[PDB]
Amino acid sequence: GFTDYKVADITLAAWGRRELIIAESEMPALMGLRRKYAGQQPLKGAKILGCIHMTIQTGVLIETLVALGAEVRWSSCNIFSTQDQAAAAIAAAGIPVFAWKGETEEEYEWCIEQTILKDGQPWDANMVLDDGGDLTEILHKKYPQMLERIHGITEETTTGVHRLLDMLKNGTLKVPAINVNDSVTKSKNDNKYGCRHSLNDAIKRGTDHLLSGKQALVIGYGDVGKGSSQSLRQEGMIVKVAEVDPICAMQACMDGFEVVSPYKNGINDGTEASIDAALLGKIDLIVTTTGNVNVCDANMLKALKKRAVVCNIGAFDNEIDTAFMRKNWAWEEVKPQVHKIHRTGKDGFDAHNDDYLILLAEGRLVNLGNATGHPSRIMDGSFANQVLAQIHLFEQKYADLPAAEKAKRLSVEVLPKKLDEEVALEMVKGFGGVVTQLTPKQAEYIGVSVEGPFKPDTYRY
Amino acid sequence: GFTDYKVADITLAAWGRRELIIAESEMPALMGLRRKYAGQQPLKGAKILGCIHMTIQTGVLIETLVALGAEVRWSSCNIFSTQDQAAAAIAAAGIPVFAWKGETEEEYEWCIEQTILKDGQPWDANMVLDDGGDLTEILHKKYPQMLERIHGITEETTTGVHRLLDMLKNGTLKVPAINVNDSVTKSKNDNKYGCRHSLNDAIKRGTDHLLSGKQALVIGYGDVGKGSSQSLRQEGMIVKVAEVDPICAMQACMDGFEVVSPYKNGINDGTEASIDAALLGKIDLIVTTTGNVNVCDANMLKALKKRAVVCNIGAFDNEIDTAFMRKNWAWEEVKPQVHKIHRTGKDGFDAHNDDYLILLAEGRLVNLGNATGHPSRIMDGSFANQVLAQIHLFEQKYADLPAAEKAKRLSVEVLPKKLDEEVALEMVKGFGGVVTQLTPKQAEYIGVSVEGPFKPDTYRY
Amino acid sequence: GFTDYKVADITLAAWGRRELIIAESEMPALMGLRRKYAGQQPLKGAKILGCIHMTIQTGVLIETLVALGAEVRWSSCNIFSTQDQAAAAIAAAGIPVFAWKGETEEEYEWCIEQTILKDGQPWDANMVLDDGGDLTEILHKKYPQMLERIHGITEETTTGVHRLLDMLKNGTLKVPAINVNDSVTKSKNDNKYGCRHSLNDAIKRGTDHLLSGKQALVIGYGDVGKGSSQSLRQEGMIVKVAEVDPICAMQACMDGFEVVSPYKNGINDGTEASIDAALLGKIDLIVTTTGNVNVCDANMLKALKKRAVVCNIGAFDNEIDTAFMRKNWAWEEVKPQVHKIHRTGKDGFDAHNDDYLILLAEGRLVNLGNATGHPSRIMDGSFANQVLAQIHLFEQKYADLPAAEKAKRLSVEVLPKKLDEEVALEMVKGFGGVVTQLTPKQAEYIGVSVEGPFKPDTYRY
Amino acid sequence: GFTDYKVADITLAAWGRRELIIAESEMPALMGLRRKYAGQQPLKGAKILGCIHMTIQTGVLIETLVALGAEVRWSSCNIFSTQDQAAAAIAAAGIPVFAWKGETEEEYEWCIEQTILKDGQPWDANMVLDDGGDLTEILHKKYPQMLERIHGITEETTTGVHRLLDMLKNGTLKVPAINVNDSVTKSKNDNKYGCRHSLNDAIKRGTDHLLSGKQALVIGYGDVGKGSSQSLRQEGMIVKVAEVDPICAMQACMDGFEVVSPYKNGINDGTEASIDAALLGKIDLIVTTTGNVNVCDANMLKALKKRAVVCNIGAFDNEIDTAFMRKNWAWEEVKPQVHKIHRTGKDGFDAHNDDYLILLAEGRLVNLGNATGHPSRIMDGSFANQVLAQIHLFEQKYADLPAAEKAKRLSVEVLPKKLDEEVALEMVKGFGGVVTQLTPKQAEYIGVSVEGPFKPDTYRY
Numbered sequence A, B, C, D: 001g002f003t004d005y006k007v008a009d010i011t012l013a014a015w016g017r018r019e020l021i022i023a024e025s026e027m028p029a030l031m032g033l034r035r036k037y038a039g040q041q042p043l044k045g046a047k048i049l050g051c052i053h054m055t056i057q058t059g060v061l062i063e064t065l066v067a068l069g070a071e072v073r074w075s076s077c078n079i080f081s082t083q084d085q086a087a088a089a090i091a092a093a094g095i096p097v098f099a100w101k102g103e104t105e106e107e108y109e110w111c112i113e114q115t116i117l118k119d120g121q122p123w124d125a126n127m128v129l130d131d132g133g134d135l136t137e138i139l140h141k142k143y144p145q146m147l148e149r150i151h152g153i154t155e156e157t158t159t160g161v162h163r164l165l166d167m168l169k170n171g172t173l174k175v176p177a178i179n180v181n182d183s184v185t186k187s188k189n190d191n192k193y194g195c196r197h198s199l200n201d202a203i204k205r206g207t208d209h210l211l212s213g214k215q216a217l218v219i220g221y222g223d224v225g226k227g228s229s230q231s232l233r234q235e236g237m238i239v240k241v242a243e244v245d246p247i248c249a250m251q252a253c254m255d256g257f258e259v260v261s262p263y264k265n266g267i268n269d270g271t272e273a274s275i276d277a278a279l280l281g282k283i284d285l286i287v288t289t290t291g292n293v294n295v296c297d298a299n300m301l302k303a304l305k306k307r308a309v310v311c312n313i314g315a316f317d318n319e320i321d322t323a324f325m326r327k328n329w330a331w332e333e334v335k336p337q338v339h340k341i342h343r344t345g346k347d348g349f350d351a352h353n354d355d356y357l358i359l360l361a362e363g364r365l366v367n368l369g370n371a372t373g374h375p376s377r378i379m380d381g382s383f384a385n386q387v388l389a390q391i392h393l394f395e396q397k398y399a400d401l402p403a404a405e406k407a408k409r410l411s412v413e414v415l416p417k418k419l420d421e422e423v424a425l426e427m428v429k430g431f432g433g434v435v436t437q438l439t440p441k442q443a444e445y446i447g448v449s450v451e452g453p454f455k456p457d458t459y460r461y
């Protein structure tokens, strides 16, 4: 028997497999790569450490990497994001996976360690697929010898890419990386439209609250903030937006949102006097989207309207000051990943107290913690990029290069625009969309190939 | 007195001045530059040849350049885009302007020549401000000795920038340029939200048609196609989108549009048989947004539903095959810039014929031809960038540089992100928006200065 | 050889006729009635006094009544709503019309009198078609003997119907009326979707203001307030709604609007202290939609943000306290139907004053005053109802009935639902819509005829 | 030792009670009635048979009836609509409830019988609260002696009201009813906005499909069809609408939808040749909203695009021909209330077959079957009307009237507009909305009391 896994319930595997078969039909770009490359086995010999939300969508990614010849050892990059039926289906296929919904922090770290170690010794990994950079950091700090044999890292998300660029600037990055996030078929698909789909989904599953007619404050208006604001406005919320970037704030104004600060004149002096108590006393829902720290701070939480919902769809659990809430206020679990936080004091609560907030997913990614994250047809884009990135770095064989050649290739790069366009075309055909083919006269006129690429690398879409 | 101008009717000046005084109140970024720089006169000695739509918005731009010390000589860059009251108010302020709504092509060329020549001889021009590149082209082909003493070109629009980059690639560009278009406070403000405002405006003014419930086809989904599609969808049109760029097409799908081609399978076979007659036979409105040639071709025009409206909001009138319609079909003027084009033949029409198309602005930019183009508060972004670009190139004094130093500076560049952010901030304050200030701990965490810039140059917004 | 008219400029007739031929193609319900009834001449001997906005749409209505055998004498029901090309085309067809854009109030009354009198004596009128009730009131108060020969009144608008119902309650109504307004193909087409089309249109034509990102207050959330709110929100305005009717307020909340009052706690105590100065100080645009009096009162006008736009789209100009502004503040005409109202005093203003409001159409219906009112394809529904109402009351011949039979028929009634459905079907076919036919089994199951009507008279749609 | 109940799992009671305490804070109109009437106990002696979806919202309704003095015996009106935690919390409070999610049809009927009988014998019921009419029908057919002592029926839904009106027409209705559905704070709140909230919710929970960019067909455009169409369009679906009522079809056109029929020219001739195969071959999602029979028929199911989702949000499961699919096609359960229906035959299926449909909730109400139905703050309106209707009929004491007095009161009536307005006001205050108070002069001008009602009974909102 296969035993090299740890999942909540292996008996969920048949359900997981039914959902994987549906997901394949929703992921034409990823299934296109399976069909194109299966014969050629471009990841034969690849041994991939994977750390990304163990969802049905990640299951189709894993089985694509395996279909192209890879071996993998997998964990989730978040304690609440695993779909237990997806983890079970992957374990039942004989793939090492260590993931369940509702891990402790200690279990989270143990699951990553179970991917790194096989039978008590470092696995002979030669590739990394990461979401958020925790596995990347553990390899660099705790297993630096393993990075001598690793050809590359493919990084999913905005925050993970920031961490790679910090290592590259400091000369501590040991292997090259592909920034998957900044493909247009990732950043301007997943980060925006994924949150559009999944933020209102997660709030409805957690609370079943009406959103129409209520007041929201979205902190941030990057790709996640844009999609989150639309998720709420399209339901009929009155959405206000906070930003530190005046260009993003300009976009929020033109998109029909009022731009406000939680702080008087936008200045946080650290005192309660700097809080716009009148603004926050009218807010029914706060959503953090920044990838920054303490953007929904203790003084903001004290000033929020009674019975406001608080949630985070960006970075870790520290966009909201959940540590302040754990120390000072009394938590009542409604159901998993839904807590009433009683502002009456730190110990006991009255079941009928009216002065509480509702926190979703303990301040962790709400779309994955309270629903199922982005849908298959959106993750198709992200995960087709991940597969292309794995193929590219594995074929370059960085770990085998002489030192002089390594020095030239030690970088954090995006995939070429031609590949971003090829992913997009498969996504468009999935919708039954028909792209026009330029005439040679038209291609000459605008200075492009009929085949593309269609835009210069400066183009922002 | 002052006679160095040609406008439709100088008696419109008082009306134009009333509208300029309103427009100043809608343009805080541009009036902020007036207030900041008036004392230091950074354009003292600047002699600007201007060629851009002679609107009220352009009037505030002209008067800002003059307030900062510049002398100008102005023309419109389109035969239909002048607002006669704007042209009159500028002439009445003693500024040379040669512009009226409804120029012939011969008059258009004569107006540009009247900016270039003062009293029959080259003007001592030392700067160019252009929209679409026609003035730039005339100087390069016909007045090369004038370009010897010109420090730079500031170019407004996507098509004009493409023409500059073609000259730079061929080594024929004689002076450096700033690509004003690709400021985020231009491309992702004017090109998108301006067309959102002004496309449905122009269609209503020209036709007074109900848009709700009718079928539109928007050709292109770049910045202008995105804003145009929203202009129509927000009115309740059923909008279909055509694209050659699969990434733009993916955006159109995720934005909730069906992506279609006028050609079967997207392929033009050179014949009528390749036209999707069933699709085009249901379309009430076609809008071209591409900057490309013949994207609404003769065979598409033959297949359109009876009484369909045809218009173009890209920079030039060759997106639609209007030459085909001039040669083959009978034009009936409804009113200025609105023609019924009778598909019954060239030599006369029945006044009650049902088989016609309605063409707006004879296929020229419809927002400016049938309405007033973008609103002041949007043009504020574009024109604040134009003023900063004029200051930057004028201060660099390229014409005065020795040959070896010119070679290092001969480029087509965008303004630095810090300036794009400073324009955006004044636009946000104009809406009463309040940007948040990062704390020192937050700025250190995300790796930015508290003052900005907030994003790397790769960021796409 | 026709002089029985007064219009601004008869030379506009050819332009008017071109626009009437376009409008016929946009009005299938009205042109369906022309085709169906032309043979029967059901209005042969009808002599209709008409008083409704002299637009292109009203032109097609007039020519339908004439095609079915009627003679008419026509005036506009508003001093600013005439389209001079429409009035000219009607005069040029030999129809008596007394209407021009920009009448004085004295000219307005003179125009209605020229319809009532032919060659200095009362016309032998036998039908009335009214919008707002002014002609109805003049006949009752000043020409009661003419009402002895009149078979009925067909009334277009909410306020005119209210005036009829007041006469009927008081026993002063002399002839029966049809309430055209309350057909679903009028009230829930024209009043709502017409204002959706034409409010943003009129504001853009008058001011060319950007609406996106700015704050609006819509007073009222009936059919006009619902359409007006959507006109603004779809442009990206942040819309707040005021209401006195809690059911309409509930709809505004669920539609995604914040419901506010100009008055603290919704109580107007007549003092400045009762004004919510903080709310009105943030408003860029106020729109009145109520059909009520003084809903934008002197204290609200004093408190509005500098440079706010003020307009009314309800039937009469006393929704806004324009009398207060005429007595106290200095009016600056920007252009026709656009005034800056300087809150600095009565007897002069600084041309560069910042403390003004912008009033559109001097507080009269803004959609008709600053644009062209509702589009042809919407007015098709209203005007097909008007024609059916004229045919129905003319055929009943009330004036010829004995007193006992008159008493049974003296009422204000709506058209039967079957006729409302027949108008709707022609409107749907105009969009290329395909209505499904019930099977006999389905019709039996839901208890309707396959031909309709499909809904009980209580149904609200 | 209370045992007079049957629920899935009594240990879910604590979770249900936490959700009821949250729901109370979202239901101000219902909690307002508790506060107002608790002292007076207007339902003291009331013995209510309730048959409505056993949700958290129904829990707050039940506990309001009990707080006002009623005893109840409860069942669900649908096999899949119970929330097991709500049923457990009501059982744990000592209230007889017979309800669980996933009843068989035999269990459904047994649950209704357990409300009717206490200890084997008719309960001393004197009131009925019904949703859909099944309990009403069972009492009329099987328990006529019980209806002798019943004062009235309060009926929730459109289909149930139709069944009452059919009994009233036939003289078979034994007790008077209130049509709760046709309160504006029910029909134009619940039926529309509830489905707006809950349709996309249920589709996401069942399938996790992306909706953006996909094609939907909504059958019907009444209140449910309007809310359903918005649920999908706001997610970015391309929505087409089918209707038999041309007035509802006109609304769909003006709302920006294409109106289509499954049948060529809208004629179902019963043959496959009448199916618009090209239309149905492009549809990803069909939603039935009609309250009619066989509106998504066998020939339509055969023609649908592979892997289309099929669901019903009308009251009963015969809108879709699920009988045809049970007889002809192989059902694969994905998870509860989600089936793949393999069009390859009845016998088995290939696990990787591509030719299937996805049916949600076995064709039963999808919002309640696959999600939690409408949110608390919407059901507040419906259920405040239910409580007022119960109070009204209970106070009238119809069963105690002599035969001659019964004959005068045997009707199906709506609540008076004043009560509809009082429910709306509490709903508006729940959003923080501020209704304006008319001045005496304004109230006199529009002919209403300052307290309301504000509209005539003919008003359609």
Ligand SMILES: NC(=O)c1ccc[n+]([C@@H]2O[C@H](COP(=O)([O-])OP(=O)(O)OC[C@H]3O[C@@H](n4cnc5c(N)ncnc54)[C@H](O)[C@@H]3O)[C@@H](O)[C@H]2O)c1
Pocket (backbone or CB within 6 Å): A157, A158, A159, A160, A190, A191, A194, A195, A219, A220, A221, A222, A223, A224, A225, A242, A243, A244, A245, A248, A289, A290, A291, A292, A295, A313, A314, A315, A316, A365, A366, A367, A368, A373, A374, B436, B438, B442, B454
């Ligand atoms: N939950 C998911 O499914 C999902 C999807 C994509 C990415 N992410 C995560 O979302 C986060 C944001 O990613 P993104 O792609 O939108 O990044 P981004 O850089 O596009 O946007 C972040 C925005 O936050 C703003 N911001 C920073 N500090 C702020 C503050 N104090 N107040 C207000 N605004 C502030 C920045 O100006 C910026 O515009 C990251 O942590 C990323 O990894 C999550």
Ligand SMILES: NC(=O)c1ccc[n+]([C@@H]2O[C@H](COP(=O)([O-])OP(=O)(O)OC[C@H]3O[C@@H](n4cnc5c(N)ncnc54)[C@H](O)[C@@H]3O)[C@@H](O)[C@H]2O)c1
Pocket (backbone or CB within 6 Å): A436, A438, A442, A446, A454, B157, B158, B159, B160, B190, B191, B194, B219, B220, B221, B222, B223, B224, B225, B242, B243, B244, B245, B248, B289, B290, B291, B292, B295, B313, B314, B315, B316, B365, B366, B367, B368, B373, B374
């Ligand atoms: N009217 C105005 O006020 C206004 C404002 C800004 C720019 N412009 C002009 O509008 C044009 C477009 O500018 P932009 O900034 O949107 O450029 P862009 O590069 O952002 O977009 C143009 C798009 O057209 C698409 N396209 C090209 N050929 C096509 C074809 N045959 N079929 C369909 N799609 C096709 C391209 O793929 C691209 O996405 C330019 O000519 C620009 O100068 C006009």
Ligand SMILES: NC(=O)c1ccc[n+]([C@@H]2O[C@H](COP(=O)([O-])OP(=O)(O)OC[C@H]3O[C@@H](n4cnc5c(N)ncnc54)[C@H](O)[C@@H]3O)[C@@H](O)[C@H]2O)c1
Pocket (backbone or CB within 6 Å): C157, C158, C159, C160, C190, C191, C194, C195, C219, C220, C221, C222, C223, C224, C225, C242, C243, C244, C245, C248, C289, C290, C291, C292, C295, C313, C314, C315, C316, C365, C366, C367, C368, C373, C374, D436, D438, D442, D454
């Ligand atoms: N083309 C046009 O401009 C056009 C079109 C149709 C109707 N009308 C006119 O528009 C007006 C409104 O018509 P409607 O059909 O919407 O009527 P309606 O009865 O549907 O709505 C009017 C609304 O005003 C609200 N209201 C009244 N007094 C108020 C106050 N003090 N503050 C806030 N709200 C208040 C009422 O509660 C009501 O809901 C009428 O005068 C009608 O004749 C104009």
Ligand SMILES: NC(=O)c1ccc[n+]([C@@H]2O[C@H](COP(=O)([O-])OP(=O)(O)OC[C@H]3O[C@@H](n4cnc5c(N)ncnc54)[C@H](O)[C@@H]3O)[C@@H](O)[C@H]2O)c1
Pocket (backbone or CB within 6 Å): C436, C438, C442, C454, D157, D158, D159, D160, D190, D191, D194, D195, D219, D220, D221, D222, D223, D224, D225, D242, D243, D244, D245, D248, D289, D290, D291, D292, D295, D313, D314, D315, D316, D365, D366, D367, D368, D373, D374
């Ligand atoms: N799921 C829920 O939570 C919920 C909510 C309220 C009502 N309901 C139920 O939804 C159903 C509809 O209710 P409603 O209030 O919208 O009713 P309605 O009368 O407002 O609308 C039903 C519509 O269906 C149309 N229709 C009938 N036959 C048709 C056909 N063959 N093709 C196309 N359209 C057709 C009718 O013309 C009508 O406009 C009822 O069964 C009602 O009880 C369910």
Ligand SMILES: Nc1ncnc2c1ncn2[C@@H]1O[C@H](CO)[C@@H](O)[C@H]1O
Pocket (backbone or CB within 6 Å): B052, B053, B055, B056, B057, B058, B077, B131, B132, B156, B157, B158, B190, B194, B315, B368, B372, B373, B374, B375, B379, B382
């Ligand atoms: N109101 C206006 N005034 C001047 N330029 C305009 C206006 N509206 C649009 N444009 C410009 O026209 C250019 C196309 O020629 C666009 O790049 C845009 O910046």
Ligand SMILES: [Cl-]
Pocket (backbone or CB within 6 Å): A439, A440, A441, A442
């Ligand atoms: Cl070619």
Ligand SMILES: [Cl-]
Pocket (backbone or CB within 6 Å): A447, A448, A453, A454, A455, A456
């Ligand atoms: Cl390129």
Ligand SMILES: [Cl-]
Pocket (backbone or CB within 6 Å): C006, C007, C008, C100
């Ligand atoms: Cl005159």
Ligand SMILES: [Cl-]
Pocket (backbone or CB within 6 Å): C014, C015
């Ligand atoms: Cl003419």
Ligand SMILES: [K+]
Pocket (backbone or CB within 6 Å): A055, A057, A372, A373, A374, A375, A376, D208
């Ligand atoms: K998912």
Ligand SMILES: [K+]
Pocket (backbone or CB within 6 Å): B055, B057, B372, B373, B374, B375, B376, C208
């Ligand atoms: K303009």
Ligand SMILES: [K+]
Pocket (backbone or CB within 6 Å): C346, C347, C348
């Ligand atoms: K004066």
Ligand SMILES: [K+]
Pocket (backbone or CB within 6 Å): B208, C055, C057, C372, C373, C374, C375, C376
């Ligand atoms: K019009």
Ligand SMILES: [K+]
Pocket (backbone or CB within 6 Å): A208, D055, D057, D372, D373, D374, D375, D376
């Ligand atoms: K619910």
